[PDB]
Amino acid sequence: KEYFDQHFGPFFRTEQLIIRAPLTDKHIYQPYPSGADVPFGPPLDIQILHQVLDLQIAIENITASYDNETVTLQDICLAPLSPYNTNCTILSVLNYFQNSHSVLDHKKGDDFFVYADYHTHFLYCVRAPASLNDTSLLHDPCLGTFGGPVFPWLVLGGYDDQNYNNATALVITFPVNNYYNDTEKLQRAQAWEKEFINFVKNYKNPNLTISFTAE
Numbered sequence: 001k002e003y004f005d006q007h008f009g010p011f012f013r014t015e016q017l018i019i020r021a022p023l024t025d026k027h028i029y030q031p032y033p034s035g036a037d038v039p040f041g042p043p044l045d046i047q048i049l050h051q052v053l054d055l056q057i058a059i060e061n062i063t064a065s066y067d068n069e070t071v072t073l074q075d076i077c078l079a080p081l082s083p084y085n086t087n088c089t090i091l092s093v094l095n096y097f098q099n100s101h102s103v104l105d106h107k108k109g110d111d112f113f114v115y116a117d118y119h120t121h122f123l124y125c126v127r128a129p130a131s132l133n134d135t136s137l138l139h140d141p142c143l144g145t146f147g148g149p150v151f152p153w154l155v156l157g158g159y160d161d162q163n164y165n166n167a168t169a170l171v172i173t174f175p176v177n178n179y180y181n182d183t184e185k186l187q188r189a190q191a192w193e194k195e196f197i198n199f200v201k202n203y204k205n206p207n208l209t210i211s212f213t214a215e
């Protein structure tokens, strides 16, 4: 998957996870006021997205030690908003909701019907991932917290044509510095990667199967 990209150009490599929801069924979203039904695959169930967001947040918080120093993802990641540590690049469907549990829960509706919710936002954002403003009543941005668009074909798997709603897998990608010319900083990044591998290997959630992708 990320082999073909040159990982992320010559100076960054990617840690990448593929995530499926084996104990979750698909479900129907009915657009308001009228319109054809849109089925959403298992990993786009609202609760599995919340659970995948917790996984993602936990990954961001992983630390490793090398000598007496501490190594965070923020020390090694691609963060294009500013020259100094910042909001790390995470290619994920959760970045359409700015990696926020509350934004994912945003909804507009009356006492009984839903006008707009995460389905509505999703279906807009896969068509306009750089948008700062959903055209629906939510008016939420699509842009990821790292300051760039997340293209839908990079963060979803197992869908037909461009029906991203029918995805059977989520793909999560963190670019990190390869540090080809800096030996001391590469060792720190590799220390972090070892903790990342451990974290993923020991992560317990019956609702998710988490795998590393084949390079």
Ligand SMILES: *[C@@H]1O[C@H](CO)[C@@H](O[C@@H]2O[C@H](CO)[C@@H](O[C@@H]3O[C@H](CO[C@H]4O[C@H](CO)[C@@H](O)[C@H](O)[C@@H]4O)[C@@H](O)[C@H](O)[C@@H]3O)[C@H](O)[C@H]2NC(C)=O)[C@H](O)[C@H]1NC(C)=O
Residues within 6 Å of the ligand: 036, 037, 038, 039, 160, 163, 165, 166
């Ligand atoms: C991937 O991409 C597409 C995303 O748009 C999917 O196409 C859509 O599929 C749905 C059905 O899943 C179509 O919705 C309508 O369904 C109703 C029937 O609704 C229910 O009611 C009857 C009983 O009255 C029940 O027996 C049925 O089983 C349903 O539970 C029909 O009346 C409509 O004519 C229509 O079929 C969408 O129209 C369709 N969208 C488009 C643009 O064609 C596609 O299914 C996905 N592919 C896979 C493999 O998952």
Ligand SMILES: *[C@@H]1O[C@H](CO)[C@@H](O[C@@H]2O[C@H](CO)[C@@H](O)[C@H](O)[C@H]2NC(C)=O)[C@H](O)[C@H]1NC(C)=O
Residues within 6 Å of the ligand: 132, 133, 135, 139
């Ligand atoms: C996001 O943009 C939309 C554009 O539709 C704004 O919503 C409405 O836009 C119309 C079109 O000119 C205005 O007449 C209304 O005043 C806007 N409605 C509201 C409730 O403000 C919306 O303001 C923008 N929001 C953000 C945060 O960018």
Ligand SMILES: *[C@@H]1O[C@H](CO)[C@@H](O[C@@H]2O[C@H](CO)[C@@H](O)[C@H](O)[C@H]2NC(C)=O)[C@H](O)[C@H]1NC(C)=O
Residues within 6 Å of the ligand: 081, 086, 087, 098, 099, 100, 145, 146
């Ligand atoms: C880094 O990303 C976070 C989101 O994870 C940004 O924080 C949001 O900032 C907006 C600014 O109006 C607030 O409305 C949100 O409530 C904030 N969200 C959270 C979860 O705190 C932050 O601004 C980004 N930093 C940079 C430098 O772009």
Ligand SMILES: *[C@@H]1O[C@H](CO)[C@@H](O[C@@H]2O[C@H](CO)[C@@H](O)[C@H](O)[C@H]2NC(C)=O)[C@H](O)[C@H]1NC(C)=O
Residues within 6 Å of the ligand: 047, 051, 204, 205, 206, 207
């Ligand atoms: C696995 O999924 C289940 C179902 O979403 C989670 O457990 C709770 O299930 C009850 C009963 O259906 C729901 O009312 C709750 O919404 C779920 N809990 C929460 C906090 O939302 C369960 O937590 C998931 N497992 C893990 C490890 O996250």
Ligand SMILES: *[C@@H]1O[C@H](CO)[C@@H](O)[C@H](O)[C@H]1NC(C)=O
Residues within 6 Å of the ligand: 181, 182
């Ligand atoms: C190569 O490493 C040195 C420090 O050892 C650093 O000053 C320099 O900026 C690095 N080169 C690049 C291209 O980042």
